[PDB]
């Protein structure tokens, strides 16, 4: 079986529709998500268009290997989707109404700049390769493009599941292709980050700043160096779930700043001590007293500047 | 082969039954569990209803590709279930008695608020999509809805395996669907948490409070900072098996409180020292003496308030 | 094809035999092991019992889809086994001699109480569901129940592979089932635990007890607190390969005891210091001197009591 | 169906073309990458060359199991590729135009010497084994050798996807083979390494050098030893994503140098202290003062020498 | 189709040959390696031996499901191999020349005693089960037993790929089996271990020995205890890629020795301090001075003794 012939020279319009059933396993590091949905396909095939006079049926149900079915694929997938045909039903005009339930691992990249406050647009690209006798173009039937209310993506708020109605028609290996953009907008649930990651990581850094109210080099060494060890240990605990990005992250910049703040604090502790031992207690005291206001104020402004630059 | 026709306009009732054989691999982070069970299906098909007069058989056993079998699927699954048909037997009225043994990775969310004292309700959603000629509705045969006595879910106490008898009939992509709720109630085995996690994590925090019986800033710095490092290391050891939740956890709140308690203790140690060095030993001593009662009492009340709020 | 009819009312006896080829991947945390073995089945089917007079064959070899074969399954499996039929051969009396090579992930629970000195009994449950016309019962042919000499389970000593000859006949979903218990006895290789885990973990705890020969609170704080950090780090290094058990482990109890011993040592160090500073050096010295004998003696007896209770 | 016969003695030329659709999962440790692409094959088969006079078709579309198709395989693959035939179309001269969409895990080694500034050349080896009647040779159709604009390999910059036009014809197990080299040039995105790995790891090492401005052995011991612990912890945090190489890495050498620099600093701290205690403060002071310039200058030159040797 | 009959009573000799294409993923912990190779099989079947007079062919090429092919399996595999038949060609005498390309996960145990200087012998066991009419025996065609020059096993040097020519004929479940031993000799690339693991781990231990040139108990406590923490952290960093062995490893013994050396050093530090405080400075000094020579000399000899015992 090959494709239905045109009346004139018109291409075959395959009306599409993706309905999300289950959506899960969003791997931040791999920039992949797993989706279990319904794929809806519709096209007219006059060859199987029959008369409600003679035909012993009103709606003719077929098996997938009895009629011509368009080779519809996904662009951004790891391997081909695990699809199970649900129903194929031909209306007397020849209109085929295909439906399958598929599960696929979609490969859509993410923007980690505004992390962990970020929002993403996940993409599902439907494609059809035009054939010898008839050229095939994709379309969006917005009545069969949706999502189940129960759909849950852990740590994210599902905003919308839509499709860019106009297909991307282009040439690929001497044949026309029709690509459709199914967009899934999601926004990260950042509550947990504040009391679980941000606040304990700020407390450890604040502990080091107590060395600006001490003259004991032994106590100061223990303070700044031990908190630096606590910091690294905390970051080990709090995992690492992001890939290596070519760009700079909001969180990326803050972390670097914190490592710089540990280094500067050591320099201060060292400077204060050297002046004190080299009989210059006024300079040693003035530097320590200044640092008490300097370190928090600089930290505050630097975070404000960064926040502004990223948001 | 398509569905049996009605006598009037009545829908086809498919009686269902899930019998748990093996239940395992409950992934807290992924909110998934693996299940190996029996799926029982029963429906009347008059087309294959024959006479115990003529028929050379008493009970007619068939192969799955000889008779019409309803397309029964699971809603909350990763990929389609790995099922192996056990037996199909037609009674001479046409009553089909289908049975298969399946294994599926079910995707049912969890509530981590009362963790590690929590209890869950796992869901297994059976679905049937109604077809062109005949509409299909699901039913519960409570005589074939159960669980094997040996069924073990490591770290959980299996309470019950039941089914919500009334199906959820609704419209989806221009056709009727019939959904059934199979509920698996489980309650976490929290013994281990008390001597393995809770008690050692409380001991490390209690060690820091010994700085309220010392005047040695060097000893106090080592006490509060080193125990903070021990705390983080202990938490690294004791793993992290929960996802990022939009809500706040009982354990989540207590942990944050402990990080705050390390910070407050540092402030005290720093305050006591600054007053002592700035020739105010009475204030330095009164603050330390108060902290001896303050820190445990505040901790006790805060834990009581939290416990009350979560339970 | 359905089952052979009885001469009278006798059930069909299917003689079984499992022969272990490869045995591996014993996951302590998941309580699963992977097995690659031979499954041997034998039953009489008079329908295919032919005469050595006429028959142009002496031993008739068949294809699995030419003759009736009993639906034999495993109870405690994740998914159904990957089996490849090796040989089916019918003797003139009708005796079928079936043989397949299968690989399955078996789900058998473990008792971690006596860990790492423990011994386990792994279970492989063979099952057959009786059918409409003929009831089916399982049997053990002990001549085809064995294991390959080379079979290796890393870190365990394979003691025996046997079968409980009497099957467990019971009712399940209105039909009889015949269950067979194939037991695989294994005993843990505990050598490594003594010099790699037990001894280094005891050395770190012994280091803390040197604070009973010091009067330097700074040295004592560093001793007890730093060794506690070393302890946790060591346990992080030495992994965590056991699940969360409802019961208490021999190793579980010892670990808790060690955390208690770190806490008590801190109390001592704190007590000795407070008395010394509050001008009571005799009490401070008597407590320290006592602890020198107290801490090791109590530890020794407590370990003896626990060892006795678990073994 | 076997191969088309030659007109004379000429071998069958199979024109090839790989078009990258999705490229991902580059495992540095495993030296593997996953690829989803189009495989294009073209050859003349006069047996199916038909006349545009009689033939009721203009372009004859076939099924893969209707015509002879060359056995094309990949050399450096884990398992055989998951390919799905897209289109087979015969032109009247007999020219077959085959196209499939495949996904394979390619096994191409990497050079970690210049890491993390490295560049790689990934290889995809196409092979065809010549047969009894006709010998088969591979060719490159550069019009169907490309990559999708969207193709993204996280942490790498895709430079080019080309093919070495001249095939590698050789003998293997008494038959000719024709191998084609598809090269994928990639260059690592090293930005992240500077502020996330290099700079914090340099700060910790610089902290240790402050012991050259102190005379307190207690402070110096804490400085050099604690920073060494911070260093190791940081490296644990920053993962380990490279295999065990027979050669020496740029990063490999620098790391070893840093461990040597921690050791030398300890020796200095120990030397300075021993001279000071053995009443030689001039030697103790001269060594410390020298080290202030020595340690950074030596480090700078050593890094310059290494950088030169590797780049 | 069943096996070719004998002329007399002779068994069927199946000539074998494994040619390594890709060899990779050697999992030390799992004692498994993945192999992609060519399997060559040859046997005479007179039934298909045809006359170069009548036969319209010179070399008859067949499809696998047209002729009898021996059921050849691998003993030490996880699951059955993923094989794709490359070519089957019958010579006029009846000699069949079979060839397939397979990928399998081989399960061959390892000896970790001499690790990381160890050498292994990997095993690939070919087996054939004799059948009813004809008994089957295996043979080695050494002209088709080899390896591709490009074959790379990361971190290992491939020494040789050979086969034990004499097969292991034995009885298994009432039938004869013929087993062939394909041996793959490999030797570990130990360069990396010296500057990356051995040397940094020796430096940390040498740092602790500086406490033999100090009288400061506070400095000594920090030295020996902090280096012990650095040691454990280093070992965490440097991974753990070996299983739990019943025997003792060369590396295993050295590690235990290092933990003992940390313990003994603490004892010394404690002893020196107690004598010094109990007004015995001569004994305290003699012990410290001795330890300066004792600790390195004992370490040197112990390593020499161990090295001798393992190599
Ligand atoms: Cl697809
Ligand atoms: Cl399903
Ligand atoms: Cl099974
Ligand atoms: Cl391939
Ligand atoms: Cl195999």
Curated annotation (Swiss-Prot), chains A, B, C, D, E:
Domain of life: Bacteria
Gene Ontology MF term list: extracellular ligand-gated monoatomic ion channel activity; identical protein binding; potassium channel activity; sodium channel activity; transmembrane signaling receptor activity
Stated name of the protein: Proton-gated ion channel
Free-text function comment from the UniProt entry: Cationic channel with similar permeabilities for Na(+) and K(+), that is activated by an increase of the proton concentration on the extracellular side. Displays no permeability for chloride ions. Shows slow kinetics of activation, no desensitization and a single channel conductance of 8 pS. Might contribute to adaptation to external pH change.
Keywords: Cell inner membrane, Cell membrane, Ion channel, Ion transport, Ligand-gated ion channel, Membrane, Potassium, Potassium channel, Potassium transport, Receptor, Signal, Sodium, Sodium channel, Sodium transport, Transmembrane, Transmembrane helix, Transport
Self-association state and partner proteins as the record states: Homopentamer.
Cytoplasmic side: 213-215, 278-280
Ways its activity is controlled: Tetraethylammonium (TEA) and tetrabutylammonium (TBA) inhibit the proton-activated currents in a dose- and voltage-dependent manner in vitro, whereas the blocker of acid sensing ion channels, amiloride, has no effect. Channel current of GLIC can be inhibited by inhaled and intravenous general anesthetics at and below concentrations used clinically. Ion conduction is also inhibited by lidocaine and by divalent transition metal ions such as cadmium ions.
Pfam families hit by this protein: Neur_chan_LBD (PF02931)
Predominant place of localization: membrane
Record topology, Periplasmic segments: 1-189, 241-248
Similarity remark: Belongs to the ligand-gated ion channel (TC 1.A.9) family.
Compartment(s) where it occurs, according to its Swiss-Prot or TrEMBL record: Cell inner membrane
Recorded topology in the membrane: Multi-pass membrane protein
Organism, scientific name: Gloeobacter violaceus (strain ATCC 29082 / PCC 7421)
TM regions (residue ranges): 190-212, 216-240, 249-277, 281-311
Note: The homologous nature of GLIC to eukaryotic nicotinic acetylcholine receptors and other eukaryotic pentameric ligand-gated ion channels, and its sensitivity to general anesthetics, define GLIC as a structural and functional model of signal transduction in the nervous system, also relevant for exploring the molecular basis of anesthetic action.
Free-text note regarding domains: Consists of an N-terminal ligand-binding domain that encloses a wide aqueous vestibule and a transmembrane domain that forms a narrow channel.
Effect of residue 218 to Q/D: Decreases binding affinity of TBA
Entry's Gene Ontology cellular component terms: plasma membrane
UniProt xrefs under InterPro entries: GABAA/Glycine_rcpt (IPR006028), Neur_chan_lig-bd (IPR006202), Neur_chan_lig-bd_sf (IPR036734), Neur_channel (IPR006201), Neuro-gated_channel_TM_sf (IPR036719), Neuro_actylchol_rec (IPR038050)
């Amino acid at each position: 079986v090959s494709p239905p012939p045109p009346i004139a020279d018109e291409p075959l319009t395959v009306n599409t529709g993706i309905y999300l059933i289950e959506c899960y396993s969003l791997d931040d590091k791999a920039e992949t998500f797993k989706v279990n949905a319904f794929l809806s396909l519709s096209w007219k095939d006059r060859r199987l268009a029959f008369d409600p006079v003679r035909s012993g049926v009103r709606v003719k149900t077929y098996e997938p290997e009895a009629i011509w079915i368009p080779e519809i694929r996904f662009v951004n997938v790891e391997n081909a989707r695990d699809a199970d045909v649900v129903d194929i039903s031909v209306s007397p005009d020849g209109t085929v109404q295909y439906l399958e339930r598929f599960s696929a691992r979609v490969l859509s990249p993410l923007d980690f700049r505004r992390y962990p406050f970020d929002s993403q647009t996940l993409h599902i690209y439907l494609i059809v390769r035009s054939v010898d006798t008839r050229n095939i173009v994709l379309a969006v039937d917005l009545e069969k493009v949706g999502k189940n209310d129960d759909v849950f993506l852990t740590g994210w708020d599902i905003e919308s599941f839509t499709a860019v109605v106009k297909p991307a028609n282009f040439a690929l290996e001497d044949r026309l292709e029709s690509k459709l953009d199914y967009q899934l907008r999601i926004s990260r649930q950042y509550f947990s980050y504040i009391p679980n990651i941000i606040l304990p990581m700020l407390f450890i850094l604040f502990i080091s700043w107590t060395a600006f109210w001490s003259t004991s080099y032994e106590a100061n060494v223990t303070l700044v160096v031990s908190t630096l060890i606590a910091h690294i240990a905390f970051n080990i605990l709090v995992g690492t779930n992001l890939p290596k990005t070519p760009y700079m992250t909001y969180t990326g910049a803050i972390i670097f700043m914190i490592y710089l703040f540990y280094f500067v604090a050591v320099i201060e502790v060292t400077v204060q001590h050297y002046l004190k031992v080299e009989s210059q207690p006024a300079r040693a005291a003035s530097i320590t007293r200044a640092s008490r206001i300097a370190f928090p104020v600089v930290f505050l402004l630097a975070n404000i500047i960064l926040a502004f630059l990223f948001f």
